[PDB]
Design an enzyme around this catalytic site. Structure first.
Site, PDB file in Angstrom:
ATOM      1  N   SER A 186       0.307  -5.904   7.719  1.00 39.49           N
ATOM      2  CA  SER A 186      -1.047  -6.483   7.388  1.00 39.49           C
ATOM      3  C   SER A 186      -0.732  -7.604   6.125  1.00 39.49           C
ATOM      4  CB  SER A 186      -1.335  -5.131   6.155  1.00 39.49           C
ATOM      5  OG  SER A 186      -2.178  -4.061   7.147  1.00 39.49           O
ATOM      6  N   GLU A 230      -4.791  -9.122  -2.978  1.00 43.28           N
ATOM      7  CA  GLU A 230      -4.813  -8.246  -4.063  1.00 43.28           C
ATOM      8  C   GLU A 230      -4.580  -8.981  -5.381  1.00 43.28           C
ATOM      9  OE1 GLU A 230      -2.959  -4.720  -3.546  1.00 43.28           O
ATOM     10  OE2 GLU A 230      -4.027  -4.494  -1.281  1.00 43.28           O
ATOM     11  N   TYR A 248     -10.644  -0.492   3.320  1.00 48.17           N
ATOM     12  CA  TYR A 248      -9.890  -1.638   3.817  1.00 48.17           C
ATOM     13  C   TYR A 248      -9.798  -1.111   5.380  1.00 48.17           C
ATOM     14  CZ  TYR A 248      -5.248  -3.328   5.192  1.00 48.17           C
ATOM     15  OH  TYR A 248      -4.218  -3.716   5.727  1.00 48.17           O
ATOM     16  N   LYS A 285      -2.889 -10.664   6.959  1.00 42.34           N
ATOM     17  CA  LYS A 285      -4.081 -10.539   6.799  1.00 42.34           C
ATOM     18  C   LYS A 285      -3.956 -11.953   5.765  1.00 42.34           C
ATOM     19  CE  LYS A 285      -5.546  -6.080   7.282  1.00 42.34           C
ATOM     20  NZ  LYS A 285      -4.606  -5.573   8.070  1.00 42.34           N
ATOM     21  N   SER A 303       2.762  -2.809   6.834  1.00 41.90           N
ATOM     22  CA  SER A 303       3.749  -2.210   7.681  1.00 41.90           C
ATOM     23  C   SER A 303       3.561  -2.301   9.024  1.00 41.90           C
ATOM     24  CB  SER A 303       3.937  -0.764   7.200  1.00 41.90           C
ATOM     25  OG  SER A 303       4.220  -0.517   6.141  1.00 41.90           O
ATOM     26  N   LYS A 356       0.646  -8.197  -1.844  1.00 50.65           N
ATOM     27  CA  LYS A 356      -0.044  -7.576  -0.665  1.00 50.65           C
ATOM     28  C   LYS A 356       1.303  -6.781   0.049  1.00 50.65           C
ATOM     29  CE  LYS A 356      -3.016  -6.149   2.615  1.00 50.65           C
ATOM     30  NZ  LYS A 356      -2.114  -5.101   2.402  1.00 50.65           N
TER      31      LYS A 356
END
Ligand SMILES: *[B@-]1(*)O[C@H](CC(=O)O)c2ccccc21
Length: 359
Positions: A64, A272, A150, A67, A315, A312
């Site tokens: 992730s 985040e 999410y 992203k 995995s 962030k």
């Protein structure tokens, strides 16, 4: 009377190295950047069976953390005038015009607030046609914009739309536009044959070698593989956006702009965000089951933190990643492993290192 490079290596040895034995992790790369100086620490094996050491060339799956690149690509397209975040997906993917999903705007897709998109696509949704049918069959549940869940399909659709707006497939948006603009020369959506020798095996919970499998909209959701030096360069770019041309600088800044809150967590674009200093529990809460796996009502930002930090986790089946940076401290850290370890352990170890490094 100990040089700083040794001080940082000792802190990483004290806080990250024990995780190798504790979780039976074959290989790990940890990097710190402080005041434009980079410190790289490599441990263990990128391939157990080949006895190949982790090193500066080792390529890891980011999960992730990919992203963050999707978010940067969206910020780039927005600032070049190719999209507005108020647009809906049917403006670009024409087959979605006048379907229920065409009521959701691009920012809501990127920040997970459509109100009815789960963590993953259904298992059977595999082909391009099945992805289209999935979105054509989508219907709202919760009110649009009100609840964060999410979601890979959500930001995946955002990435596909960003790519459509740029007239290129998403993999090419990253490999031909975004990675070169950020100065990343060993980052890939698709690792070429000439680099497969550098692609680590991942390791499952039985310590068996594996790598990520194809999936629907995999590239914008979790499709990036990279090296420790490239990830340190990416952190450098986030710490110093004024060092890039206007469109890339603005794209990076878009990823730093908090959009709403869930308690102490600010949802930026991909990243985040948190008020700094952040308590350890604030950072752990961001990766709690309540926040990651369940819908939560969002609130407008009230305190806009002048002093802040960003992180962030990511995995895949065989890899773990954590990235964190603190602009006003001019510091960041990257952890890459070729076996998953609990997110709380990544967050705790980075917190201990970053708070102990001398300023
Ligand atoms: B993408 O980001 C999160 C990372 C995490 O909390 O472990 C995640 C979890 C499961 C699937 C995809 C992602």
């Amino acid at each position: 009377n100990t040089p700083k490079d040794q001080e940082i290596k000792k802190l990483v040895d004290q806080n990250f190295k024990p995780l190798l034995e504790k979780y039976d992790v074959p290989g790990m790369a940890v990097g710190v950047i402080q005041n434009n100086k980079k410190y790289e620490m490599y441990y263990g094996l990128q391939s157990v069976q080949d006895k190949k050491a982790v090193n500066s060339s080792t390529i890891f799956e980011l999960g992730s953390v990919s992203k963050l690149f999707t978010a940067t690509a969206g910020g780039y397209a927005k600032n070049k005038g190719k999209i507005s975040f108020d647009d809906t997906p049917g403006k670009y993917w024409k087959e979605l015009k006048n379907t229920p999903i065409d009521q959701v705007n691009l920012l809501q897709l990127a920040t997970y607030t459509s109100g009815n998109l789960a963590l993953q696509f259904p298992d059977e949704v595999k082909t391009d046609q099945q992805v289209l049918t999935f979105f054509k069959d989508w219907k709202p549940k919760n009110s649009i914009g009100e609840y964060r869940q999410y979601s890979n399909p959500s930001i995946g659709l955002f990435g596909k739309v960003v790519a459509l707006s740029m007239n290129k497939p998403f993999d090419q948006v990253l490999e031909k536009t975004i990675f070169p603009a950020l100065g990343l020369k060993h980052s890939y959506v698709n690792v070429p044959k000439t680099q497969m020798q550098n692609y680590a095996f991942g390791y499952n919970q039985e310590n068996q070698p594996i790598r990520v499998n194809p999936g629907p909209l995999d590239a914008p959701a979790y499709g990036v593989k990279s090296t420790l030096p490239d990830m340190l360069s990416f952190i450098h770019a986030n710490l110093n956006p004024q060092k890039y041309p206007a469109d890339i600088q603005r794209a990076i800044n878009e990823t730093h702009q908090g959009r709403y809150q869930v308690n102490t967590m600010y949802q930026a674009l991909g990243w985040e965000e948190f008020s700094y200093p952040a308590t350890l529990q604030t950072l752990l809460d961001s990766n709690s089951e309540q926040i990651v796996m369940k819908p939560n009502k969002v609130t407008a930002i009230s305190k806009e933190p002048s002093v802040k930090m960003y992180h962030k986790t990511g995995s895949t089946t065989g890899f773990g990643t954590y990235v964190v940076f603190i602009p006003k401290e001019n510091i960041g850290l990257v952890m890459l492993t070729n076996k998953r370890i609990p997110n709380e352990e990544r967050i705790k170890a980075a917190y201990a290192v970053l708070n102990a490094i001398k300023k």
